[PDB]
């Protein structure tokens, strides 16, 4: 009985990160699970107790000033709401919890034990449904499940997707396929099914090395080369056909940057001009799918040298599949004022602010 | 006067047995022993569209360009090209076998000098590198340092490790100490996944995507040091597009400008560093022939110095080697990409 | 209807590599495959149009005498009668076709075009059961499925999983998650249905490096290294639960050995002594599944400096769960009358040449 | 005469900030910029029950082995001790940035040399070493070799590539320079899957699996030639098994007189060389502590040179460090282990 997200003269923010308080997830987990992560942590695709391959740098790549007076940023759900839900009218504010927070802060999903795994994205989904969700209800969550044990995750996607607070299913940007591999097709069934969109977050992880050519050194190789995962991703979700098999199905490609699609894009259509006959079931030509399918946020926002080339790019992406996000609290925070260059137009402003966003998770 | 420069064509060896006559007797033996496997790649798979073009002389089996006549045939016949660089992309760099790797890359330009170098002196090649040992590599590139027909260091787009890793310097030393511009040309060891996320399954999902790897080979080569330790390095992209080039170069400054003092010795934007250090070939042209696509992407980059021009032969892409011009009202700049921009590479004149 | 197999004086050979003859294999292939391969060959975890990362080194790797008048070995059915069935009175001779074509080993479930593969896993199972199986029955079929696509797989088993001329589920060494993943679980399952049991033979490909710490250089490293595989495979699906899941799947690693696997299961319960608490939901120890799950062929046959090592290494074990193999036509065959040293009982050579692989591949007399 | 020598024991860096007196101000500071993110290993989970048995003297944390006097008050308590080999398995080794690497590298050993072999001279150590840079693993093997304390090169038993390929022959070239066995320790960088088959989903099945990461670097030491091209030099499995060495042993021995002109350089068996050239720590001795076992596992190796004793200080085991006395009864083969095998490795008088 909580009411659908209404936008009218507020925006839409696609990434929000909360993290647990230190303990807040034990309710919601078996006695097995606490006693497990007392003993062994949260094992994953590292060598390292506490940390990811790639720990973050400058302050743990927090904007510096929101800290509460106890927790981790995002940790508290009053600051939250100041600093952030009202500062810049979010009516809309989607949660992507990418940590269970405490002594580990590696996505629940990509947990080693994927039994362990599971266990981990329901207590999250019950905790940032009970504390921020339903007491605030700005805020609607992208649902945490197991990408890389699709059973579990369409188990968890039928016991809260239909949840009024609940409005995508949150995965990785790092797979050990290619998101366009049948072996995930159940996990998009189980969400058409419940007419879920997909948000697939900025990660490390996943199973490979960070680029497809050797494991970065420099913290500039490690954060650009986030976006390579994305384009990695969407030639295999578009070639694949993975959208004529679900023609219902929205995908967003949260925080891997937006101008490099259009080139991307691009070069698929030119590149399959030529040799189109080896998927020959494909029913479209590669770029028809995005306006229907591909979605993407824009934190943090390109800036090229001529800010002119910004829009133009952007609308050789799909206009109407740009949605805006604050990234909040990490550094590279994007502001609803002042993301945009001064001279950006001002009806593309407003729908990304707005429009897009409304139409990717089903408001009306 | 700068000559055209057909910056991008390829020999395709007919099979491992043309390698024979230029290999000791150990491992010629051995590989007649062996049956003669075939490195032959899948980068262009034989039998697809994008193989060889229909207007092409093919050989005896119907194969393009496994000979120099049938190359210099087809290349040269409308006079409009001056030289040509030669790349034959036979995957010796596949070879794990490192002593067979070191002797089959050695063979491999023996074979391309003599019966392609010495057979028409329009053509240029670069040399084939084992990267397996970059110690190796960097012995094979002063082997070749002499001999001035060879123009460039080959390297495959794909690595085992990044080519900015201390690792791979042996490579960059040698290369800027005989002169030579390094190419990466689509294609890889395959040592790891193509891709981050998982290997491609289709050859169409990893060729359109390689370009994410010359994103990651790039900001590896300026972030570890390259420009700064060889300042006279030049890196062609020959035929992995360039349309992407933009969007990368805005991220990758950006963010050195927060990282910076990460990596402090880069005291020049990456913005700047990849205008004067990144030539790109223009096959494929990935739809920058379109329209006012080209003067749009030469406006991106922020210079008209990096396209330089290239055929592909043989391959076939959906546009051809001239319909660039299509994309652009500059004749300025369709003389920088057809002669000028290769100038700065080779100094080859007419 | 074909009979079940019968072996009374003769022998099993869990392992036999035949190739279909050029073009064989079109008559059970649609037709828009067939111009998939002829454009874009089989493209698999390589960056090579016609070879897998580690070629073959010294004459395909085949006997020098198995080649037939023409063609390769193990391609013509005369042949492979007489030279092996024929000459070493074997009784039921488990196919393992490797390879589409006349190649030696070329898997065509690893074909990264899964659509691709599984088409060719279903023309392989009908031609081998036309062409060698139905003429012979002295041979059966471990039948090729696609384990990295589970779906077709479990497709696969169904449609021909129960025809007589099959004994035994075909997959491969190397693959993208360890066996005893939640994924593969749906092959477990149709197997079970279908009564049959899983044969791993050695591979290359896989999706990862043929080491767990980097690619091999020189070929000692390349072929002692396919053990490595099959130690890490067995600790999967043993620490994993899968049989906890399953209890009646047998599975039987194929070209890794056997020696090996003793000291491993030594070091796995050891281990599991200290730290079994990370994994309370297994239910027995896990040595204790190697009787009923764990099966082992000979070939190419272990062989330490002191010859009582090997039948030592073989109880510990499971001297139950060992079967012969000849691997026939590859170079390291293992000839049934010479592979076991001077002093080993004749008890237990009897079980590895009959009885062991009997009651794996569900056989009675 | 020589020394009981415990082979291999254990430092537990409290935290990175117990680096923070061992690092230029450059690193200092940035370190407790970064909030100092911990490189602990998830080698022995410290809350799991092989981090420590109830026996070790623990800290003010509950922690065992952060303290030089903790652990010699424990390890040498009944006086059968002579010396022991500090190995601290911080994960320097799995930070990318490889002159952070490098600095922490330095560091860490500069910890050892100050807070423990300075405080006992009954400790050696191992030296820490930069795994990313072959050059830097090597100039760091050449900045200890003047203390002589540091008694072996401290290796992951997973790399990046194989310790065999010719880029990693700079380490092997300089532990031999130094006279210094080369000791490969359970662990890794993690930078491919632990296995030829992807990721364990458990530490355990991951710590059990780590054997056959050891076969490969053994067969790619000794293919590659190292043991030729550095005949001095020693290698030494630390807290790996030993059960499975034999059958691998002959493996390799009868695929070596396949192969032998793909490798012409071993002219002697794999069989010989690697009892020759290898040693085993005792420590998890996984089943040869039974009745019998150990007799018969050295009847399986052909040698009694290889094994020598360590404790693993202060894990736990199934068996204790003198429970291997179960598995034989040759009193002269307890004389190998626990003194004679190890003076080939540190030449230890007491
Ligand atoms: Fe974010
Ligand atoms: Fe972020
Ligand atoms: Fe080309
Ligand atoms: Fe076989
Ligand atoms: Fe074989
Ligand atoms: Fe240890």
């Known amino acids: 009985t909580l009411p659908a997200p209404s936008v009218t003269t507020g925006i839409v923010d696609a990434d929000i990160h909360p993290v647990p308080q230190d303990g807040a997830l034990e309710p919601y987990l078996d006695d097995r699970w606490k006693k497990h992560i007392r003993e062994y942590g949260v094992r994953t695709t590292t060598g390292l107790q506490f940390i990811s391959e790639y720990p973050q740098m400058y302050g743990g790549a927090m904007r510096a000033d929101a800290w509460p007076e106890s927790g981790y940023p995002g940790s508290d759900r009053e600051l939250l709401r100041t600093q952030l839900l009202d500062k810049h009218n979010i009516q809309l504010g989607v949660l992507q919890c990418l940590a269970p927070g405490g002594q580990t802060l590696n996505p629940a999903g990509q947990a080693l034990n994927q039994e362990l795994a599971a266990a981990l994205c329901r207590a999250t989904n019950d905790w940032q449904l009970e504390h921020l969700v339903y007491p605030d209800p700005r805020m609607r969550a992208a649902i945490p499940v197991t990408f890389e044990t699709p059973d579990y995750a369409v188990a968890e996607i039928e016991r809260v997707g239909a949840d009024p607070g609940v409005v995508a299913v949150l995965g990785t940007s790092k797979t050990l396929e290619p998101l366009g591999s049948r072996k995930y097709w159940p996990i998009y069934e189980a969400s058409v099914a419940q007419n879920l969109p997909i948000q697939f977050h900025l990660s490390q992880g996943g199973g490979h090395a960070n680029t497809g050519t050797g494991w970065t050194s420099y913290h500039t190789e490690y954060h650009t080369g986030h976006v390579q995962s994305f384009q990695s991703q969407l030639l295999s979700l578009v070639l694949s056909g993975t959208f004529d098999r679900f023609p219902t199905l929205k995908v967003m490609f949260v925080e891997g940057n937006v101008a490099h699609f259009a080139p991307l894009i691009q070069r698929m259509d030119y590149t399959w001009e030529t040799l189109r006959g080896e998927l020959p079931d494909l029913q479209r030509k590669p770029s028809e799918y995005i306006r229907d399918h591909i979605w993407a946020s824009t934190q943090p926002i390109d800036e090229p040298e001529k800010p002119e080339h910004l829009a133009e790019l952007l609308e050789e992406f799909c206009g109407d599949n740009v949605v805006f996000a604050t990234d909040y609290p990490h550094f590279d925070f994007d502001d609803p004022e002042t993301a945009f260059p001064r001279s950006f137009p001002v009806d593309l402003r407003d729908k990304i602010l707005r429009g897009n966003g409304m139409r990717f998770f089903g408001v009306t | ?350």
């Open chain 2, 1 to 350: 006067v700068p000559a055209v420069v057909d910056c991008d064509v390829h020999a395709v060896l007919p099979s491992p047995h043309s390698l024979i006559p230029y290999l000791d007797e150990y491992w010629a033996d051995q590989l007649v022993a062996q049956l003669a496997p075939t490195y032959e790649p899948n980068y262009h798979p034989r039998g697809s569209a994008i193989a060889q073009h229909s207007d092409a002389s093919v050989d005896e089996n119907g194969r393009a360009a496994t000979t120099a006549e049938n190359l210099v045939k087809d290349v040269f016949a409308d006079g409009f090209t001056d030289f040509a660089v030669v790349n034959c992309l036979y995957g010796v760099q596949q070879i794990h076998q490192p002593r067979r790797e070191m002797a089959h890359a050695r063979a491999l330009n023996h074979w391309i000098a003599n019966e392609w170098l010495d057979k028409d002196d329009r053509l240029r090649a670069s040399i084939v590198v084992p990267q397996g040992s970059p110690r190796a590599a960097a012995e094979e590139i002063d082997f070749w340092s002499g001999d001035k027909r060879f123009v460039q260091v080959l390297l495959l787009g794909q690595s085992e490790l990044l080519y900015g890793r201390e690792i791979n310097w042996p490579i960059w030393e040698a290369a800027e100490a005989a002169g030579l511009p390094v190419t990466l040309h689509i294609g890889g060891v395959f040592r790891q996944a193509p891709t981050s996320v998982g290997w491609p399954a289709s050859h169409l999902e990893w060729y359109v995507g390689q370009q994410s790897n010359i994103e990651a080979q790039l900001n590896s080569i300026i972030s570890e040091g390259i420009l700064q330790k060889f300042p006279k390095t030049k890196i062609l992209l020959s035929e992995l597009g360039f349309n992407w080039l933009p969007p990368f170069m805005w991220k990758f400054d950006k963010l050195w400008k927060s990282y910076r003092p990460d990596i402090p010795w880069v005291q020049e934007s990456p913005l700047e560093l990849i205008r004067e250090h990144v030539r790109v070939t223009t096959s494929p042209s990935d739809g920058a022939e379109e329209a006012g696509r080209l003067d749009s992407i030469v406006d991106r980059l922020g210079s008209d110095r990096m396209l330089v021009y290239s055929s592909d032969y043989p391959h076939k892409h959906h546009s051809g080697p001239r319909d660039i011009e299509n994309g652009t009202h500059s004749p300025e700049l369709l003389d920088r990409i057809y002669r000028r921009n290769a100038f700065d590479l080779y100094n080859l004149v007419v």
